[PDB]
Design a protein around this ligand. Structure first.
Ligand SMILES: Nc1ncnc2c1ncn2[C@@H]1O[C@H](COP(=O)(O)OP(=O)(O)NP(=O)(O)O)[C@@H](O)[C@H]1O
Ligand SMILES: [Ca+2]
Length: 378
């Protein structure tokens, strides 16, 4: 049974497999190459992935996400305390360990963060198995470079309870390098910058590779900056526009807002390829259909300060690593948000026209590298 590579993201997960020298990123039941890290509990079932995310608008208290932010931490953890104040689901304390509390089939139940992740891990496992036509046992799971021993332990545990023989836990930036082959022995030292901007986190890693051996020289970023923040800006923009056109503030209606955001995230993806996209939502508030559009120019304008500030963590990374722009040999893009044109322009201008590594879908790069690593480990 082939060993697979799994990227367990805060917002999206991806699974790949190495077969015949080639790596294949496995698409799910809905045909997506990445599946949301969402779990939802209802009166009749346990929904995982797209099915879960597709119903969050009508089950905010029983649809769990962001488990990667909980995994391996304590309830008393300041991070946990801050974050929990924004999740629409319950987080309880159990002997100092944080636990998610939801209502499943009328009964009230709670789960440890690692149990939630194992649910996502199981979905990936079945996605692979469905594709491969064989049971997947061995696997390599990826984790941010800054995860401590507890967080790594928890990620490993989530895997074992999902029935996966976790061959190894390797850092995400290292996985991204291997995907590009930046680990090949060339008889010299090589500094690589991993620019990872996914759904909810931004990480900048500077790796040094000497004889196939990696050395994370520095890291920086923002655990609270990602594609979701860009969507927010569009939502606020459209709320104002709806109010401007219909004198009706839809902010209070949580269903209206959640449906609008879904339309925005979709428009955003389209903007990375086209110059403008349309927002077509039937009866957003009351019976008023919201039909409008946005241009890429307007979109860039809405997030100008966010995009620009993305360069601060990069400068900090160089500073700490004790390297200048000139010294970094390779720059690889990771995360679905790196598909945004203005962000690609921004990074190149910073690195004075230097070419960016981006032939492998940025949101599949981590999975891609893990798959190769799984293959060699098997
Ligand atoms: N074409 C696109 N243009 C812009 N953003 C995109 C595009 N395709 C996907 N995304 C965004 O990329 C994000 C998904 O990133 P991805 O790297 O798959 O997440 P992840 O691994 O969960 N990362 P993180 O959330 O940081 O742990 C969401 O905010 C998507 O809207
Ligand atoms: Ca990541």
């Amino acid at each position: 049974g082939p060993a697979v590579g799994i990227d367990l993201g805060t917002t999206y997960s991806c699974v790949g497999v190495f077969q015949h020298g080639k790596v294949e990123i496995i698409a799910n039941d809905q045909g997506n190459r990445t599946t949301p890290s969402y779990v939802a509990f209802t009166d009749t079932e346990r929904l995982i992935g797209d099915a879960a995310k597709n119903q969050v608008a009508m089950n905010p208290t029983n649809t769990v996400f962001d488990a990667k932010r909980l995994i391996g931490r304590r309830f008393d953890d300041a991070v946990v305390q801050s974050d929990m104040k924004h999740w629409p689901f319950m987080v309880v304390n159990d002997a100092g360990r944080p636990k998610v509390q939801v209502e499943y089939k009328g009964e009230t139940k709670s789960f440890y963060p690692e149990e939630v992740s194992s649910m996502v891990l199981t979905k990936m496992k079945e996605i692979a198995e469905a594709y491969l036509g064989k049971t997947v046992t061995n696997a390599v799971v990826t984790v941010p470079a800054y995860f401590n021993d507890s967080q790594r332990q928890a990620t490993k545990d989530a895997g074992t309870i999902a029935g996966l023989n976790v061959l190894r836990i390797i850092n995400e930036p290292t996985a991204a390098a291997i995907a590009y082959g930046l680990d090949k022995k060339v008889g010299a030292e090589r500094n690589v910058l991993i620019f990872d901007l996914g759904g909810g986190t931004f990480d900048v890693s500077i790796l040094t590779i000497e004889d196939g051996i990696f050395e994370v020289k520095s890291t920086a970023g923002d655990t609270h900056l990602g594609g979701e923040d860009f969507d927010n800006r569009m939502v606020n923009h459209f709320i104002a526009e709806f109010k401007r056109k219909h004198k009706k503030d839809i902010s209070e209606n949580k269903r209206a807002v959640r449906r609008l955001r879904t339309a925005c995230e979709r428009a955003k993806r389209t903007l990375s390829s086209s110059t403008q996209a349309s927002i077509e939502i039937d009866s957003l508030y009351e019976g008023i259909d919201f039909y409008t559009s946005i241009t890429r120019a307007r979109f860039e304008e809405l997030n100008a300060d966010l995009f620009r500030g993305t360069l601060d963590p990069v400068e900090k990374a160089l500073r700490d690593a004790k390297l200048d722009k000139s010294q970094i040999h390779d720059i690889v893009l990771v995360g679905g948000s790196t598909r945004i044109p203005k962000i690609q322009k921004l990074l190149q201008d910073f690195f004075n026209g230097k070419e960016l590594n981006k032939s492998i879908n940025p949101d599949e790069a981590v999975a891609y590298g893990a798959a190769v690593q799984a293959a060699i480990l098997s």
